[PDB]
From Swiss-Prot, chains A, B:
This is Beta-lactoglobulin. InterPro entries: Blactoglobulin, Calycin, Lipocalin, Lipocalin_CS, Lipocln_cytosolic_FA-bd_dom. PANTHER family: GLYCODELIN (PTHR11430:SF117), LIPOCALIN (PTHR11430). The gene is LGB. CDD domains: lipocalin_beta-LG-like. It comes from Bos taurus (Bovine). Synthesized in mammary gland and secreted in milk. Disulfide bonds join 106-119, 106-121. Its main location: secreted. Belongs to the calycin superfamily. Lipocalin family. GO terms for molecular function: identical protein binding; long-chain fatty acid binding; retinol binding. It comes from the Eukaryota. It is found in: Secreted. Alternate disulfide bonds occur in equal amounts in all variants examined. Changing residue 59 to H: In variant C; found only in the Jersey breed.
Amino acid sequence: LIVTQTMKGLDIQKVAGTWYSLAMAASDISLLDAQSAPLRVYVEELKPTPEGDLEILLQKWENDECAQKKIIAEKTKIPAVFKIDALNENKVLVLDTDYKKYLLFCMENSAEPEQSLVCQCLVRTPEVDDEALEKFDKALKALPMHIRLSFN
Amino acid sequence: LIVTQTMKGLDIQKVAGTWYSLAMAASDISLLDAQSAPLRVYVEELKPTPEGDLEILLQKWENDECAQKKIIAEKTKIPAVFKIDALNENKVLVLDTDYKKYLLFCMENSAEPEQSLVCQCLVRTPEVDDEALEKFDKALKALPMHIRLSFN
């Protein structure tokens, strides 16, 4: 990705609160094949830390259960780009957000071969509104997504 | 679906030959979740029978293997609509085909609650041409597809 495709003037403190994963897209089928993929998560909550970092509350499908996992994304030199300092490092890219309604973000795997990428459209409330989905779609044409999910 | 969304003037004898599954879409995520779903098949070949019926050579993911399954779709009173006379009956709807390049078809589950539906874009040769994908996309806007796959 590029620094221009990311958001500009992002205020991490305004993304706080709960969010709902509405749609999912991925560059490689496998990445979201079954409930399988390690990138097949659902953002439940976003909590920024005073030092500017990003705490993310996810939920996964684990052993017929809905597992809660908490991972922290560290602030990098570039805004809207966060790093999940793990054995396998991941970068959380925030593309666009109005803070109030939607929030589009992606997770990129560097270690992998080409560009393992996965994005999510997050809505504040599960309203019968579809501006978020639209914004999502427009923001994904410029990317090679091979799988596309939309949730009930 | 409706008799107008199906093809008109379809010549089953011209669809003979081999085909490749290029893209997949489904009305319900589950239907194509992992290699899982019973509708997660890949058309390898289409062989029409003299009596007008349709023999389909599929391949599935079975026990870490690529299983070959042959099912026959019986000719119904309406053209481009075929029935897979099974315990669980299924209807194979052919939407549009130029016989030479692409072929768009869907599989609908009647027994299910609402409208279990799954469609495939089939190409003759895996060319670097994308008219088929386009035709596929246009033919799916008028349908509630929640999952969308595209193969390497």
